[PDB]
């Protein structure tokens, strides 16, 4: 009977950085995905492992909403079988991904004339991320054989970098708020159904 708090995830005042993406489990509610369309035209509304015409006529054990902020030229990485700094080092989707990716422009909220600093992304990693893995480790990246001793320098780079979102950037470099809706099926009674049951 209760509606799923999808609006709370999309209407957050400040979104999380991609290296430290947020996650909320949606459970025991009616999932009417029309509530999210109060958020303007979407730059991307792509679903995988599921029929988009069935999004309001399906029951699942749980639904997961992962939210973060990337550049425009990086939204294509939030998809199964993709490469790049976001997919390799920040947020990785599995090949058998069952869900939808929803991205909209946030230049008017996530950019300042001086340059947004809190929105950061990981630039270096010794290995690619596993699907749905999260890396918040803040160690200096040792590119060579010489240890780094905890300070950046030659062949020793800080792993996290800021976007520096300014309003006068091109749309490819402007901030975009992404929400990844994950549909979970386990051998357990379903707690999230659509309005059409």
């Amino acid at each position, epitope marked *: 009977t209760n509606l799923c708090p999808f609006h709370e995830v999309f209407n957050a005042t400040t979104f999380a950085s991609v290296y430290a993406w947020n*996650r*909320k*489990r949606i*459970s025991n509610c009616v999932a009417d995905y029309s509530v999210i369309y109060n958020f303007a035209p979407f730059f991307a509304f792509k679903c995988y492992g599921v029929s988009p015409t069935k999004l309001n006529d399906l029951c699942f*054990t*749980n639904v*997961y909403a992962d939210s973060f902020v990337i550049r425009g030229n990086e939204v294509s990485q939030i998809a199964p079988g993709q490469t790049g700094n976001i997919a390799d080092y920040n947020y990785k989707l*599995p090949d058998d991904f069952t869900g939808c990716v929803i991205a909209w422009n946030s230049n008017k909220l996530d950019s300042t004339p001086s340059g947004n600093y809190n929105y950061r992304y990981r630039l270096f990693r010794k*290995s690619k991320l*596993k*699907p*749905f*893995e*999260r*890396d*918040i*480790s*803040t*160690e200096i990246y*040792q590119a060579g054989n010489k*240890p780094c001793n905890g300070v950046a320098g030659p062949n020793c780079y800080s792993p996290l970098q800021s976007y520096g979102f300014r309003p006068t950037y091109g749309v490819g470099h402007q901030p975009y708020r992404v929400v990844v809706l*994950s549909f*979970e099926l*386990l*051998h*357990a009674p379903a707690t999230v159904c659509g309005p059409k049951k």
Partner: antibody
Amino acid sequence: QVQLVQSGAEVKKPGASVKVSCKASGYTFTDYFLHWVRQAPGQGLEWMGWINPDSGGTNYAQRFQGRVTMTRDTSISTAYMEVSRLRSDDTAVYYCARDNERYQMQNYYHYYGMDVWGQGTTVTVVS
Amino acid sequence: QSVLTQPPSASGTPGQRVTISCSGSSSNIGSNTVNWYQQLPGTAPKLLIYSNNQRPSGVPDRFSGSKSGTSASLAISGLQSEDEADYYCAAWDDSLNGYVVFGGGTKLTVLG
């Protein structure tokens, strides 16, 4: 008070069974996985498995697959650990520890640590 | 199944910096994050480090974690008498169905 309180000490004979309780409070019981770690006297820590209290799914260590059953009771926010065919080698302190990553997906699990720990339940196997 | 190798013992005088190594393989430390625990006598383990170098809320900044290859290391700078305890490393091992591997533990003795 985010807390894990376990049942009292147990003394059993070899071959018998024991069921240890682990009650959670101060947080949503189904948000976090629960681990089971035991420690023989004077020995190190040994991982026994995790259980997802949201679904009941488990992942036992290979050494305990067959003699150990983990269950949940969301009604009273209590996790149970039952060991069958108790050996003298099972005499140890049994801990329940909370998985420190919220909202895990069972089929895409990632272990990052155990933040909340219970006081332990002593199990002594003597004849 | 796997074994994370720690030095059996380690010592240091008050105020010094002590390091405790944790040697694993490619399927545990080389593939996953490393977390560290402190265990006082007659006490349940306490999380000191997680996600390689992150400290939980309330863990003093004199504790430091690091990961490199298939090895990890815990550093206790500004050693105090209260730091005398057993210290464990742990990491997920991707082998088989997956399992948490605890190190053998290292007993820290604050001399002086």
